[PDB]
Every structure is written in C-alpha cells, then in structure tokens.
Design a protein around this ligand. Structure first.
Ligand code: HEM
Ligand code: HEM
Ligand code: HEM
Length: 72
C-alpha cells in the first residue's frame, strides 16, 4: 500500500504515502504514537499539522484547496 485515498464531498484527496516516507526518511514525525492509524485524523487535522500545515512550513507540497482536492 503506497497511496491512501480520502473520499470527500469537495473532491477526493490522494495521499502518496510511500513518497512521503521516502522524502522524510522517518516515521515518528507523522506517527507520534508509533506507526499505524493516527487517532483523531479528520478535516481539521489534515488542514493543520496532519497535512497542509507541513506543506506550508516546508514550502513544498499542495497548499491550495484544488491541489489536494480533485474530482469534483
Ligand atoms: C517508514 C515510516 C512509516 C511507517 C512504518 C508508516 C506506517 C503507516 C501505516 C501502517 C499506515 C496505515 C494505518 C491504518 O491503516 O490505519 C499509515 C498511514 C498513514 N501514515 Fe504512515 N508510516 C510511515 C511514514 C509516514 C510519514 C512520514 C507520514 C507523514 C508525512 C505518514 C502519514 C500517515 C498518514 C496520514 C496515514 C493515515 C492515518 C489514518 O488513516 O489514520 N506516515 N502509515
Ligand atoms: C482552503 C482550501 C481547502 C478547502 C476549502 C478544503 C475543504 C475540505 C472540506 C470541506 C473537507 C471535509 C470533507 C468534505 O466536506 O468533503 C476537507 C477534508 C480534507 N481535506 Fe481539505 N480543504 C482545503 C485544503 C486542503 C489541502 C491543501 C489538503 C491537502 C494538503 C486537504 C486535505 C484534506 C483531507 C485529507 C481531508 C479529509 C480528512 C478526513 O478524511 O477526515 N484539504 N477539506
Ligand atoms: C495525509 C496528509 C497529507 C497529504 C494529503 C499530503 C499530500 C501531498 C501530495 C499530493 C504531495 C505531492 C506529491 C507529488 O509531488 O506528486 C505531497 C508532497 C509532499 N508532502 Fe505531503 N501530504 C500530507 C502530509 C504531509 C506531511 C505531514 C508532511 C511534512 C511533515 C508532508 C510533506 C511533503 C513533502 C516533503 C512533499 C514532497 C514529496 C515529493 O514530491 O517527493 N506532507 N504531499
């Protein structure tokens, strides 16, 4: 499993998981409580430190709505 798709009303988001693990070369950063499900992962988390927040800080990755949400 390399890609994780999040089906959302506003347009589905595809998370290229392997790309991220290869790019960051670490697990604990995103998986604070050890690799596995991330408890409480939702819209607010994704728009925050869960997804968009990192892209803004690292200045790489999608930060604009449509660069994540695609498919109508
Ligand atoms: C080799 C290091 C990594 C390991 C072993 C790992 C492992 C996993 C596993 C086992 C899953 C599936 C969990 C499930 O089905 O509930 C997953 C999901 C996920 N991983 Fe990783 N991961 C790694 C690195 C990363 C990195 C670097 C990020 C952050 C850029 C990340 C973010 C996520 C997210 C957001 C999910 C979905 C969580 C959820 O749906 O609750 N992972 N990862
Ligand atoms: C201000 C611009 C954005 C808007 C207006 C927006 C809007 C939304 C909305 C309304 C939801 C809730 C689900 C739905 O109603 O369909 C959502 C979920 C989510 N958004 Fe965004 N989003 C934006 C930017 C982003 C960006 C840039 C990313 C990717 C880095 C992203 C990733 C996600 C993810 C992964 C979820 C699903 C979380 C879950 O499955 O619980 N969004 N977004
Ligand atoms: C589930 C939440 C996240 C979503 C939906 C997401 C989505 C994406 C997508 C679609 C790309 C662009 C891939 C491409 O170049 O085609 C990307 C790239 C990237 N993201 Fe995320 N991301 C998430 C979380 C994170 C987190 C938490 C970090 C930092 C702690 C991060 C760091 C990066 C970096 C470094 C890249 C460049 C990877 C590359 O192009 O090789 N992302 N992200």
């Amino acid at each position: 499993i390399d890609k994780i798709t999040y089906p959302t009303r506003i347009g589905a988001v595809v998370f290229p998981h392997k790309k991220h693990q290869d790019a960051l070369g670490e697990c604990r950063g995103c998986h604070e409580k050890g690799p596995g499900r991330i408890d409480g992962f939702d819209k607010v988390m994704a728009h925050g430190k869960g997804c968009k927040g990192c892209h803004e800080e690292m200045k790489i990755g999608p930060v604009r709505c449509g660069d994540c949400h695609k498919g109508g």
